[PDB]
């Protein structure tokens, strides 16, 4: 529980909903890479790490074992389902706000469980598509997840933004406002 | 509200004092409950919860399965740590300092740095101010950079020079940024 | 250089 560095050499996720799965490696709380289980390729999140190799079949076979163990635990627990947690959403800028300078809006969606969420950006009455990216579901000690969405923007005095979050723990979609101030 | 059954597997390595201390804890989680784990310090599977008892019974009875798990500390943790020594542990991103008036409040923004270790001090006329400073927690941006904001409760006068003092392992010498009215 | 990963094992049915 106490160390200089903690690494997850295999964050394996499988859930009955989709059914969907996720495979990632984490080091000191950051996503090293994920495996696109559909495309069967390793996608590295840090440029320096592209020099390495990881066989996606390790992820594909890992998820297949989880699918097996999940059906076992569903049966053993008399179909005990997951509890919907109320996610926590906070929006902030990557760097200080200057009306001229480019920036990045960060939408942190914390305490996600189950790992099924919709994160969309709204500006002045329409959804924003250009320049938004997402991290994978990042693991937490309490076995919930958090997820971060980015929106590259050019701050303007009249342009305000909203982070729209859809989760089963929410009775209505949660909007977190961000104003250039 | 759809029903969902979730399964997680985390192969976690804990590093301390370089390679002096290495520990592997593989956690099998159903929903948000760790049910059975293999901790290399004990050297065999241990049920964490009532549901993980049949799994630990079965795995501990297979010497072959027990062989690979005991070697996973060397095969996985130690092997990858040598890769981390040349990559993530070499990553050094210089923090970007910026002072922005909020006058009676002063905010020193330390943005986009890695690794996480940071030290921020305020300075008013070569005299360090500690009675009027308030700092946000360490913020993880999710893109392998961190940021931290240190606010300053101040009372300006004609001739005051406010200086923010930042120390970071990427720096050979601390960074200093000044502000005058 | 190749990255190594821990492997879970099946159980039950």
């Amino acid at each position: 529980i106490v160390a200089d560095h903690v690494a997850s050499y295999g964050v394996n996720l499988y859930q009955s909903y989709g059914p969907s799965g996720q495979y990632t490696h984490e080091f000191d709380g950051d996503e090293q890479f994920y495996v696109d289980l559909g495309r069967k390729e390793t996608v590295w999140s840090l440029p320096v790490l592209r020099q390495f190799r990881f066989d996606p079949q390790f992820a594909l076979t890992n998820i297949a074992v989880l699918k097996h163990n999940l059906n076992s635990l569903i049966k053993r627990s008399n179909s005990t389902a997951a509890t919907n947690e109320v996610p926590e959403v906070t929006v902030f800028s990557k760097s200080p706000v200057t009306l001229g300078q480019p920036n990045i809006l960060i939408c942190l969606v914390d305490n996600i469980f189950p790992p099924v969420v919709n994160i969309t950006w709204l500006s002045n009455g329409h959804s924003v598509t250009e320049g938004v990216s997402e991290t994978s579901f990042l693991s937490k000690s309490d076995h919930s997840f958090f997820k971060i969405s980015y929106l590259t923007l050019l701050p303007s005095a009249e342009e305000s933004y909203d982070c729209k979050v859809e989760h089963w723990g929410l009775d209505k979609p949660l909007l977190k406002h961000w104003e250039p101030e | 509200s759809p029903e969902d059954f979730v399964y997680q597997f985390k192969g976690m390595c804990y590093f301390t004092n370089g390679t002096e201390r290495v520990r592997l804890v593989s956690r099998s989680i159903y929903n948000r409950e760790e049910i059975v784990r293999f901790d290399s310090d004990v050297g065999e599977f241990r049920a964490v919860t009532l549901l993980g008892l049949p799994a630990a019974e079965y795995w501990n009875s297979q010497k072959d399965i027990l062989e690979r798990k005991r070697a996973a500390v060397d095969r996985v943790c130690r092997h990858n740590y040598q890769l981390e020594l040349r990559t993530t542990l070499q990553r050094r991103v210089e923090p970007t300092v910026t002072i922005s008036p909020s006058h009676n409040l002063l905010v020193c923004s330390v943005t986009d740095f890695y690794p996480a270790q940071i030290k921020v001090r305020w300075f008013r006329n070569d005299q360090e101010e500690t009675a009027g400073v308030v700092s946000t927690p360490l913020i993880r941006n999710g893109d392998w950079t961190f940021q931290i904001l240190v606010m300053l409760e101040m009372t300006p006068q004609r001739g005051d020079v406010y200086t923010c003092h930042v120390e970071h392992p990427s720096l050979q010498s601390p960074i200093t940024v000044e502000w005058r009215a | 250089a190749v990255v190594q990963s821990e492997l879970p094992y099946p159980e039950g049915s």
Partner: T-cell receptor, first 114, second 108 residues
Framework: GVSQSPSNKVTEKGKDVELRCDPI?????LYWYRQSLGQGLEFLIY????????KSGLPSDRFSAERTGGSVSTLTIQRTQQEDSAVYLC?????????????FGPGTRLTVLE | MKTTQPPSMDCAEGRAANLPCNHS???????VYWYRQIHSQGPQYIIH???NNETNEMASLIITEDRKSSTLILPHATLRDTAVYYC??????????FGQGTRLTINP
Amino acid sequence: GVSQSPSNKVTEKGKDVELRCDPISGHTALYWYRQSLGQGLEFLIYFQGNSAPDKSGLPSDRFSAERTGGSVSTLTIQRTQQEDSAVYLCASSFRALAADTQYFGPGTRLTVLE
Amino acid sequence: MKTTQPPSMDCAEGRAANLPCNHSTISGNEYVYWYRQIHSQGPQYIIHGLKNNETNEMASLIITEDRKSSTLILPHATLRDTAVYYCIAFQGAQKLVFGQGTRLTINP
């Protein structure tokens, strides 16, 4: 032990043949090989659970394998050729890609004739 | 890492049969596996090991301290031990590969 059927199969070319394999109970990884003599072990395909992540290794598109139940697997050779004649071996282990001990079956000696 | 074995060997029945295997380039994650195949059936798993010495009800396996060579020991050879014996360096991979093995003959 791993079971395989049939033990022998003599067929005319162009016919479809179906091989059966019964893995050890509790083994979620299942492997297909074929062996000529003199020749070595030729890998064909493997299954983790009911899915085969490695479809390559099959000699041609006339070869197809299934393990729908997650237990018993079947290998089908449509429109057999002369070169298909071999001893088709089946194996199973706890898990794939884990260096688990692979246990073999008696095999199916297939002979295809013009 | 590949393995090399003597192509053919002889042993008298009732005596311990020692089969050698060389694997100098073996890595830390590669196990030393032994199979035998009687003419001409399915391969039979004999024994395997990493660093220690293992003992089956079928045979024993002695691995040198540097892991660069190994020995399979059939305790009390009979006619049923006449087969081809394969020594393999095995790590995480789908394919298990057989070399030429040792054509072991047990003479009466």
